[PDB]
């Protein structure tokens, strides 16, 4: 899983 | 001011910091595309009827979004992320359980080399089993900005559970930013709305994007606001911040960017101007 900062 | 309004919203997040504990459980870690984007426990879609050998079978990264506190399911939405390879079966369990008959996909499967949604529908005319669910792709209808897929969903081994699920797949949203004008989205949303309205017992409309918050929140908030204008007319009160706050009380971070915020206002204004013509 990762990181959504768009 | 749009810039001031969106900044004020981004600051107000500290009071919608509701628990997200189920999505943080070890068993659910690999069911989230993004470690930090999780459903609130109190509005999450709880999946029933799971495989009794699976210790945790009740989790999907998705929340019910009601435009108003009393909303029927037919007037509600499910905001969710695009399927992961290991959550396709849970996605169809959700669609079946919630009686959803319309799905709004806001991404391609892949954009800029990254998976935004694993394909969860069969090729046209084909039949696939996804766990206990069976799906036939009956027909695809291709429009300029979107493709409609008529899917028939049923539970394997149980007759008379079949229902049609209409997947509206928006295909031209830009890889970065938002469409420069809302005409395509407005025409797409009009078809989605009439389809949902035409189905008697329909459950919530499922709407998804890579994380289930940015494009998903943009489409849902536009749809809510246009439906207010449908009921109340072009001179009604429209409060974009308050509507964003309402959906954000039900899933964190809905509407991610200032361009999306500006796009919502533009979509509503264009909807109004087409009516006034």
Numbering used by the authors:
A (entry chain B): 893 to 898
B (entry chain A): 5 to 281
How do the authors describe this structure?
SHP2 tyrosine phosphatase (SH2 domain containing phosphatase 2, also known as PTPN11) has recently emerged as a key player in cell proliferation and immunity, providing an attractive therapeutic target for cancer. SHP2 activity is regulated by autoinhibition, unlocked by recruitment to specific pTyr-containing motif pairs. Here we present a concise structural study on how the activity of SHP2 phosphatase is controlled by an asymmetric, dual phosphorylation of its substrates. The structure of SHP2 has been determined with three different substrate peptides, unveiling the versatile and highly dynamic nature of substrate recruitment.
Two of them represent substrates modulated by a phosphorylated +4 position: the 15 aa long pY632-pS636 peptide from human IRS1 (ppIRS1) and the 16 aa long pY191-pT195 peptide from human CD28 (ppCD28); The third peptide, the 13aa long pS892-pY896 (ppSRev-IRS1, shortened Rev-IRS1 peptide) from human IRS1 represents a reverse orientation, modulated by a −4 phosphorylation site. To prove that a negative charge at the −4 position in a substrate also increases the catalytic activity of SHP2, we selected the Y896 site of IRS1, where a conserved Ser phosphorylation site flanks this GRB2-binding pTyr from the N-terminal side (HPPEPKSPGEYVNIEFGS motif). The rate of dephosphorylation is greatly enhanced by the −4 phoshoserine, similarly to what we had seen with the +4 modifications earlier using the IRS1 Y632-S636 site containing peptide. Conversely, the −4 Ser phosphorylated peptide bound one magnitude stronger to the inactive SHP2 catalytic domain despite both SRev-IRS1 peptides already containing a negatively charged Glu at the +4 position. Our solved crystal structures clearly present SHP2 with an open WPD loop, despite the catalytic site being occupied by a phosphotyrosine peptide. Likewise, the other two structures show an asparagine from the substrate at the same position (+2), stacking against the similarly dislocated pTyr residue. In the case of the ppsRev-IRS1 carrying a −4 pSer residue, a somewhat more complex picture emerged: Here, the phosphoserine was either coordinated by Lys274 and Lys280 (“Hill” region), or Arg278 and Lys364 (as well as Lys−5) in an alternative conformation. What is more, the +4 position carrying a glutamate residue was loosely associated with the same loop region that coordinated the +4 pSer/pThr residues of the two previous complexes. In case of the ppSRev-IRS1 (−4 phosphorylated), the pSer coordination dynamically alternated between the “Hill” site (Lys270, Lys274) and the “Loop” site (Lys364, Arg278), with an intra-chain Lys-5 also contacting this residue in the majority of runs.
